[PDB]
C-alpha cells in the first residue's frame, strides 16, 4: 500500500515518545524518509535564498529506526550559519504557524530543521553541530537536513543529507562510510574540526499513488520543460564561485609542491573536473536545443 | 452618551443621514467619519434596505474622497444585488467602471479591470471601449479621453500642479506602459507623436516612470531614445522553444478532440515502430 | 586647491613657493620627487572622472603645452 | 452544465507543480484521515504582473458547511496572510483550488466568497478520480453574464503552462524517476525528445491524411500546423548567434582550463613516479 | 477567427448571387476575420466564381492567399476598398513576410505595404498586436521588426505538401538527435567500462 | 560647524536650545535656527520640530523661515529654497553664522537633485542639467567633478560631446575575474609542476 505511510496513528507516536528507544543507542535513528513534497518545498526555499543561508522546519513522525519527513516550512530568520540556534528568532512564529496546521488536518509535529548550504555542500558546521546538539538535548526526536540548491542545479542531481549529532563526550564507531564532497577552503577546517561529532542518515523519498498519476500526467506537458532548461546562466554564479575557490586550492598545491598535506593537487583536479563536467553539460544542453529547433529552415 | 439605549436602525439611520448632510456640504472627511461609525453597526440590522443605503452612501463617500479602488469596489459589489433594480445595478456598475479607470494604477486596479471586463454587463456602457482598451494595455487616444471626461463627475476631474488633471496624466502613464510592451527602443519625437504629447513630455515623464520604478528602462539623452526592459538573448530563445512546444501540444489536443478515430489509429503506429 | 580640482592655481602657488623651499635644510633634497609625485597625482585626479577629455583645456589647466602634456601622459600611461 | 461556455478571456496562467503536488498531499492526507475522499479545499499564491499570473505555492484553507453551504473562515485566511507574507514577501493571494470533477454550485457560492477578499481570483480544480489520459487539472476565471435576464456568475477554462524553474524542474525530474556521468544526465533530454517526436509524427499524419484524402478536411487545424511549421526556425537573429557562440566559447575555455589542470596533474603523477624509478630522487 | 466562422456560414448556406457578393464586402470589413478558408471553399461562393461577380471572388482570393502589392498590381480589376480593409490585407502581408523571415527590416516592409513614414508602419503593426494577429517588439535603433508569432492564413490545398516537407525535415532532425544521444551514451559507457577494466589490469600487477 | 563636525554641533546646539528654554529668550529662537542649520547641515536630520521642545515652537514667526527652509530641503527642492530665501532675505542672510554655509547647503539640495535627475539616463546632457538645476555650465562640470570624485555619482564625463556617460555597463564580469585567477594560478602551477624532474 503506496499510501499506509500517510496514516498518521497518534497513539502510536505517543507510545514511541514515551519509550524513548533513542536513549537506549546513539545510533538508534539510521533512516530518513522524506516526501517529495518535503523535498520539493525545501528545495524550492533553498533555491529561493540563491547564494545566502536560509532555513525551515520540517514537519514528520517516528517509526523504529526511521525518521519522516512529511512536510516543511520556511523560518524568517537572520544568521543561519552564524547564529547558534538562529530558528529561536522565530519561536513565536514555530508556535503559530504549528497552531493554524493543526487547524487545517497537518497533525505531524515538528521532527527536524532544514538548512541550506549553497555551492558548499552537505554537512553540519561548528554552529549546526551546537544548534543540533540543543535540539537533541531538548527537542529529542530530531534531524538535521542540509541541502545545496546550487549544486543541485548545476549537478542535476538533489544534493542533500540527513544528519544526527553525537552527546558531549560520547565517541563514534568504525562506521563512517563519508561519500566525498568538494569543501571549500573557507570552510574545510570547521568542517575537519566538528566532521567526527554527528553522523548521517540513509536518505529516501516517497510519494503517494495520487502524486505517482499526477507526476506521469504532468510529464505528459512538462515535457517542454526540459527543452527549455537554461541551465548555464540561471545559477551562473555558482561555477564562478567554485572556480574563485579552486584557484585558491591550487595556490595550496603549489605550496605544498614547492617545499613541503596527502596530495592537495589531485583532489584540486577531481573539484576542477566535477566543476568543468557540469559546464560541459550546460552546453550538451543547449547544443541539443540548438540542434532540435534552429537547424531546421524552411 | 445618553441614558437611552437607541435600536442598531435608529443609529444606523442616524449616522446615514448624518453622513448624507456632510456630503450634501461638501464635506466628505467629516461624512467618512460618521459613515465609519455606522459600518460598525450595518452588520448588526436585520433591514436589507437600510444597509443597502449605507452601502450606497459608502461607495460615493469614497468616491467623493477620491478612494477610487476602494468605491469601485463597493459599487461592484452593489452591482451584484439582486434586490437592486437592475437600472440600479447598472448605475452602480458604471460608478464602479468609472471609478476604477480613474484609479491610481496597480494590482488592485488591475484585477478590478479585469473582474469589470469579465461582466458582460459593461458592454452597455459607453466607457466599454476605454475598460477594454486599458485591461489589454492598448494606446488610448485623445479624442476617445475627450468623450470619457465628459462622462465624469467635476469632482472626479482633479486638476494636480499645471492645470492637467490626474486623468489625462494616468492615460499618458498608461499609454507609456503600453508602448513599453510594444517596443525595445523609441524615439521622443516618435513617443511623442504616438501618444499625442510633445517629445520633451514623452521625456519627461518617461524618467518619471522609470525613477519612481513604475516602468523598467532607460534614457539616452544624446541619441534621444529610451529603451524599454528587453529582456532578449537566450532566456528569449528558451520561451519561445516554449511558445512552439505548447503550440504543439495544443494542436495534438485539437487533433484527438475533433478526430479521435484517427488519432487511436497513429497512435498505435507509434507502438508497432 | 588640489581637493578643490583648481590645479592651475595649485600649481601656479607650488611654483611660487619651489624656489623659497629649495633654500630649506631637510626639506630640499626631496623637492624634485614631492613636486614629481604632487604633478602626478594631480593628473591622474585631473582625468579620473572623464571618458574623454581635452587636451588643450588639460595644457591650460597644468600650466603646460600642448605636446608637452603628451609626451607626460604618454610617460604615465606607459607606467602609472 | 451550468458554466460560460464561449469566448476566452483575460489572464496568462503558468502553474508551478509544487501547487500541484500540495492539492496531492492535501487530498491524499484528508482522504487517509477519514478513509473515504474527501473534498479540499485551499488558496493560491503567487505573481501577477499585469494580465500574466504565475502560480507558486498553496496552502490549506478551514471551512465549514451551513446546512448544505461551504463557509470559508475568513479570519483563518487572514491570519494565514499574516504568516506567509513574513517569507513569501514578494508573493500575493491569487486564487483557490478544490477536488473533484467538473465546476458545480458549490463551487459558485464558494467562489463569490473568495470574490470579497481578491478581486479577480482564479479557481483550480484537480480531478484524484480521473477516468481520462490529459492531466487532471483545470483552471478557470469567473465571468458574471446574463442569461434569460438574470445577471449570473459562471465559469470560462483558462489554458495553462508549466512553470521554467530549474530546481523544480530537477526535483520533479528526481521524484518522477525514483529508482557514467553523461549516460545519467542526457536521458530526461533524450526522453523529452522522443515525447516531441511522437507529437511531431502524430500532427505530420494528420497533415498526410488530410492531404491525400478520406480523413476529414479541416482549414482551421491544418491552418494551425502551417503557423506551427513557420515557427521554426527559432531565434536565427545575429545577435542570438553572438550570444550562443559566446556561451560556447565561455564553456569552451573552461572546458580547456579544466582539461589543463587534469593534465597538470597527470605530469605531476609521472614525475612523482619517474623520480622514484629511473632516478634516484 | 472562431464564433464569426458559424456566424457567417449560418447566413453563407443560406444567400444568393449578389447577397453573398454583398458579404464578401461584409466579411472583409470586420475586425477579427483574417482567415477565410471555409468561406472561399463553399460551392455558394464557387457559383460567383468566372460570373458576375468574379472580382469579388478574385478580392477575397487576394485576401486568403495574396498580399496589398499583389492587390495593387491588380486594383484596376478588384473592387475598390476603404481604409480598414485595406489596414486588414496590410496585416496580412505583414504576417506572409513574418511567416518568410524572423526579422523584419522597415524598408521591406514600407515597400511591400506601400507606406510613406515610419509612425504609420509602427501603427499598423500596433493595430495587428491588438487585434492578436501577431506577437512581437519593433526596434527602432536596428530599424527592425521582431517577429515572435503569426498566424496562419493560407490553405493551399495543393502546396499543403510543403508542411509535410518541412515536419518530416524536422522528424528526421529529431531522429538525428535521437540516434546521436544513444550513440554518445553508448561511447560514454564504452569508454567508462574500458577504463575500469584497464584500471582492473593496472593493479593487476601490484601483487607482482 | 567653523571646524567641520556638524553632528557635535547638533548636540551641543539641542542640550544648549535645552538650558536656553528652561531660562528663556532671547537666545532661545537664535540657538533653534542654528540647531536647525546644524539638522540640515548634518546630512540630515531632517527632523528638528519632531523632536522633544521644539515641538510647539514651530509656530513662532521669527524661526517659520527655517521651518520652510528644513521641509525645502527634507524634499529636496531648490526652487523652493531659493523662494524662501527670497521671501526671509533679512530672516536668514543679516546672520553671518547661517550665511557662510547657506551655499554648502544649497550645492547639497542640488547634489541630491542631479543624483535624482541622473538615475534614469546612461548619456546626459551637460547643458540640459545646467537648465535643469539653474546653474552655470561651468559650475555643472565642476559640480560633476568634485561629484565622482567623491563616489557619490557612478560614472564619467565626456568633455567633447559636452555629455554626462553614466556607470550602466553591468554585466557578468565575476566569472572573467575567477577565470582569470584559476588561469595565473594555473600558469604558476604548471611552472613548478615541471620544475620537479631536474
Ligand atoms: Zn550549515
Known amino acids: 500500500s503506496i499510501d499506509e505511510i500517510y496514516k498518521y496513528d497518534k497513539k502510536q507516536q505517543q507510545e514511541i515518545l514515551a519509550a524513548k528507544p533513542w536513549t537506549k543507542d546513539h545510533h538508534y535513528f539510521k533512516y530518513c524518509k522524506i516526501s517529495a513534497l518535503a523535498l520539493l518545498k525545501m528545495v524550492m526555499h533553498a533555491r529561493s535564498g540563491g547564494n545566502l543561508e536560509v532555513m525551515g522546519l520540517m514537519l514528520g513522525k517516528v517509526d523504529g529506526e526511521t525518521m519522516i519527513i512529511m512536510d516543511s516550512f520556511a523560518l524568517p530568520v537572520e544568521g543561519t550559519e552564524t547564529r547558534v540556534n538562529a530558528q529561536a528568532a522565530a519561536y513565536e512564529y514555530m508556535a503559530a504557524y504549528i497552531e493554524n496546521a493543526k487547524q487545517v488536518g497537518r497533525l505531524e509535529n515538528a521532527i527536524g530543521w532544514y538548512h541550506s548550504h549553497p555551492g558548499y555542500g552537505c554537512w553540519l558546521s561548528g554552529i549546526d553541530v551546537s544548534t543540533q546538539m540543543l535540539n537533541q538535548q531538548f527537542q529529542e526526536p530530531f534531524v538535521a537536513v542540509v541541502i545545496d540548491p546550487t549544486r543541485t542545479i548545476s549537478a542535476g542531481k538533489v544534493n542533500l543529507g540527513a544528519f544526527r549529532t553525537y552527546p558531549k563526550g560520547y565517541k563514534p564507531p568504525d562506521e563512517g562510510p563519508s561519500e566525498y564532497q568538494t569543501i571549500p577552503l573557507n570552510k574545510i577546517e570547521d568542517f575537519g574540526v566538528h566532521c567526527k561529532q554527528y553522523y548521517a542518515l540513509e536518505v529516501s523519498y516517497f510519494k503517494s499513488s495520487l502524486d505517482r498519476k499526477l507526476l506521469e500526467l504532468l510529464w505528459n506537458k512538462y515535457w517542454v520543460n526540459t527543452l527549455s532548461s537554461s541551465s548555464l546562466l540561471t545559477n551562473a554564479d555558482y561555477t564562478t564561485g567554485q572556480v574563485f575557490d579552486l584557484s585558491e586550492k591550487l595556490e595550496q598545491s603549489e605550496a605544498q609542491l614547492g617545499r613541503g598535506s596527502e596530495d592537495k593537487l589531485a583532489k584540486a583536479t577531481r573539484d576542477s573536473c566535477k566543476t568543468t563536467i557540469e559546464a560541459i553539460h550546460g552546453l550538451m544542453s543547449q547544443v541539443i536545443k540548438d540542434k532540435l529547433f534552429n537547424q531546421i529552415n524552411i | 452618551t445618553g441614558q437611552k439605549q437607541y435600536n442598531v436602525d435608529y443609529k444606523l439611520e442616524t449616522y446615514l443621514k448624518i453622513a448624507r448632510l456632510y456630503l450634501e456640504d461638501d464635506d466628505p472627511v467629516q461624512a467618512e467619519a460618521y459613515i465609519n461609525r455606522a459600518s460598525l453597526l450595518q452588520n448588526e440590522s436585520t433591514n436589507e434596505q437600510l444597509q443597502i443605503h449605507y452601502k450606497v452612501c459608502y461607495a460615493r463617500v469614497l468616491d467623493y474622497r477620491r478612494k477610487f479602488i476602494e468605491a469601485a469596489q463597493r459599487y461592484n459589489e452593489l452591482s451584484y444585488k439582486t434586490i437592486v433594480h437592475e437600472s440600479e445595478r447598472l448605475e452602480a456598475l458604471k460608478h464602479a467602471l468609472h471609478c476604477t479607470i480613474l484609479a491610481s494604477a496597480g494590482q488592485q486596479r488591475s484585477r478590478m479591470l479585469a473582474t469589470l471586463f469579465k461582466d458582460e454587463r459593461c458592454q452597455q456602457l459607453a466607457a466599454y471601449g476605454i475598460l477594454e482598451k486599458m485591461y489589454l494595455d492598448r494606446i488610448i487616444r485623445g479624442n476617445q479621453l475627450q468623450e470619457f471626461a465628459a462622462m465624469l463627475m467635476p469632482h472626479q476631474k482633479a486638476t494636480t500642479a499645471d492645470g492637467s488633471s490626474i486623468l489625462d496624466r494616468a492615460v499618458i502613464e498608461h499609454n507609456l506602459l503600453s508602448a513599453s510592451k510594444l517596443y525595445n527602443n523609441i524615439t521622443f519625437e516618435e513617443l511623442g507623436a504616438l501618444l499625442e504629447i510633445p517629445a520633451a513630455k514623452a521625456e519627461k515623464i518617461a524618467s518619471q516612470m522609470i525613477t519612481e520604478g513604475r516602468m523598467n528602462g532607460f534614457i539616452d539623452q544624446i541619441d534621444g531614445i529610451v529603451h524599454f526592459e528587453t529582456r532578449e538573448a537566450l532566456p528569449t530563445w528558451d520561451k519561445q522553444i516554449q511558445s512552439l512546444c505548447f503550440q504543439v501540444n495544443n494542436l495534438l489536443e485539437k487533433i484527438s478532440q475533433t478526430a479521435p478515430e484517427w488519432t487511436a489509429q497513429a497512435m498505435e503506429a507509434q507502438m508497432a515502430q | 586647491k588640489f581637493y578643490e580640482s583648481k590645479y592651475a592655481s595649485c600649481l601656479k602657488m607650488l611654483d611660487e613657493m619651489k624656489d623659497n623651499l629649495l633654500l630649506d635644510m631637510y626639506l630640499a633634497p626631496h623637492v624634485r620627487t614631492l613636486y614629481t609625485q604632487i604633478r602626478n597625482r594631480a593628473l591622474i585626479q585631473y582625468f579620473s572622472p572623464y571618458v574623454s577629455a581635452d587636451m588643450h583645456r588639460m595644457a591650460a589647466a597644468f600650466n603646460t603645452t600642448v605636446a608637452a602634456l603628451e609626451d607626460e601622459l604618454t610617460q604615465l600611461i606607459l607606467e602609472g | 452544465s451550468v458554466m460560460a461556455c464561449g469566448v476566452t478571456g483575460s489572464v496568462s496562467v503558468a502553474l508551478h507543480p509544487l501547487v500541484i503536488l500540495n492539492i496531492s498531499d492535501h487530498w491524499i492526507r484528508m482522504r487517509s484521515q477519514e478513509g473515504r475522499p474527501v473534498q479540499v479545499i485551499g488558496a493560491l499564491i503567487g505573481k501577477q504582473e499585469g494580465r500574466n499570473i504565475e502560480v507558486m505555492n498553496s496552502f490549506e484553507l478551514l471551512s465549514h458547511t451551513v446546512e448544505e453551504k461551504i463557509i470559508i473562515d475568513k479570519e483563518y485566511y487572514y491570519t494565514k496572510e499574516e504568516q506567509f507574507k513574513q517569507v513569501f514577501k514578494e508573493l500575493e493571494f491569487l486564487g483557490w483550488y478544490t477536488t473533484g470533477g467538473p465546476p458545480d454550485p458549490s463551487d459558485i457560492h464558494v467562489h463569490k466568497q473568495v470574490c470579497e477578499i481578491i478581486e479577480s481570483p482564479l479557481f483550480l480544480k484537480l480531478n484524484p478520480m480521473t477516468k481520462h489520459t490529459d492531466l487532471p487539472v483545470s483552471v478557470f476565471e469567473s465571468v458574471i453574464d446574463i442569461i434569460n435576464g438574470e445577471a449570473t456568475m459562471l465559469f470560462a477554462e ?83 548567434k553572438t550570444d550562443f557562440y559566446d556561451q560556447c566559447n565561455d564553456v569552451g575555455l573552461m572546458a580547456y582550463l579544466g582539461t589543463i589542470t587534469k593534465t597538470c596533474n597527470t605530469m605531476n603523477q609521472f614525475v612523482n613516479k619517474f623520480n622514484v624509478l629511473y632516478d634516484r630522487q | 477567427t472562431g464564433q464569426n466562422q458559424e456566424q457567417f456560414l449560418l447566413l453563407a448556406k ?195 | 560647524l567653523r571646524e567641520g563636525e556638524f553632528e557635535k554641533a547638533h548636540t551641543d546646539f539641542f542640550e544648549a536650545f535645552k538650558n536656553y528654554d528652561e531660562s528663556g529668550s532671547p537666545r532661545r529662537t537664535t540657538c533653534l535656527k542654528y540647531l536647525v542649520l546644524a539638522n540640515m547641515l548634518m546630512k540630515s536630520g531632517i527632523n528638528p520640530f519632531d523632536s522633544q521642545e521644539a515641538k510647539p515652537y514651530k509656530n513662532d514667526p521669527e524661526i517659520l523661515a527655517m521651518t520652510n527652509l528644513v521641509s525645502a530641503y527634507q524634499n529636496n527642492d531648490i526652487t523652493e529654497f531659493e523662494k524662501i530665501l527670497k521671501t526671509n532675505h533679512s530672516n536668514i542672510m543679516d546672520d553671518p553664522f547661517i550665511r557662510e554655509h547657506i551655499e554648502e547647503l544649497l550645492r547639497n539640495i542640488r547634489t541630491q537633485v542631479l543624483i535624482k535627475l541622473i538615475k534614469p539616463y546612461t548619456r546626459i546632457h551637460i547643458p540640459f542639467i545646467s537648465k535643469e538645476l539653474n546653474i552655470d555650465v561651468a559650475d555643472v562640470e565642476s559640480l560633476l567633478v568634485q561629484c565622482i570624485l567623491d563616489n557619490t555619482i557612478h560614472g564619467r564625463i565626456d568633455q567633447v560631446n559636452q555629455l554626462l556617460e553614466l556607470d550602466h555597463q553591468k554585466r557578468g564580469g565575476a566569472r572573467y575575474t575567477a577565470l582569470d585567477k584559476w588561469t595565473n594560478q594555473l600558469n604558476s602551477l604548471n611552472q613548478a609542476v615541471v620544475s620537479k624532474l631536474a
Open chain 5, 14 to 208: 443560406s444567400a444568393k448571387g449578389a447577397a453573398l457578393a454583398t458579404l464578401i464586402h461584409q466579411v472583409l470589413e470586420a475586425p477579427g476575420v483574417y482567415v477565410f478558408g471555409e468561406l472561399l471553399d463553399m460551392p455558394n461562393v464557387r457559383e460567383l466564381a468566372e460570373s458576375d461577380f468574379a472580382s469579388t471572388f478574385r478580392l477575397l482570393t487576394v485576401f486568403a492567399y495574396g498580399t496589398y502589392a499583389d492587390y495593387l498590381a491588380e486594383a484596376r480589376n478588384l473592387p475598390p476598398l476603404t481604409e480598414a480593409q485595406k489596414n486588414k490585407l496590410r496585416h496580412l502581408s505583414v504576417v506572409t513576410l513574418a511567416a518568410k523571415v524572423k526579422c523584419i527590416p522597415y524598408a521591406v516592409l514600407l515597400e511591400a505595404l506601400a507606406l510613406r513614414n515610419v509612425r504609420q508602419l509602427e501603427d499598423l503593426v500596433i493595430e495587428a498586436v491588438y487585434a492578436d494577429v501577431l506577437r512581437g517588439s519593433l526596434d527602432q535603433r536596428n530599424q527592425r521588426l521582431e517577429v515572435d508569432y503569426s498566424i496562419g492564413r493560407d490553405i493551399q490545398r495543393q502546396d499543403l505538401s510543403a508542411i509535410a516537407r518541412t515536419l518530416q525535415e524536422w522528424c528526421v532532425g529529431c531522429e538525428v538527435v535521437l540516434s546521436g544521444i544513444e550513440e554518445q551514451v553508448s561511447r560514454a559507457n564504452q569508454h567508462k567500462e574500458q577504463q575500469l577494466g584497464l584500471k582492473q589490469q593496472i593493479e593487476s600487477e601490484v601483487a607482482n
Open chain 4, 158 to 240: 483558462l489554458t495553462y503552462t508549466l512553470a521554467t524553474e530549474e530546481a523544480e524542474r530537477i526535483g520533479v525530474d528526481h521524484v518522477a524517476r525514483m529508482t557514467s556521468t553523461v549516460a545519467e544526465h542526457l536521458i530526461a533530454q533524450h526522453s523529452a525528445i522522443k515525447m516531441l517526436h511522437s507529437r511531431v509524427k502524430l500532427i505530420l499524419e494528420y497533415v498526410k491524411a488530410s492531404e491525400a484524402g478520406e480523413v476529414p478536411f479541416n482549414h482551421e487545424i491544418l491552418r494551425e500546423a502551417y503557423a506551427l511549421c513557420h515557427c521554426l526556425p527559432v531565434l536565427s537573429t545575429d545577435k542570438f
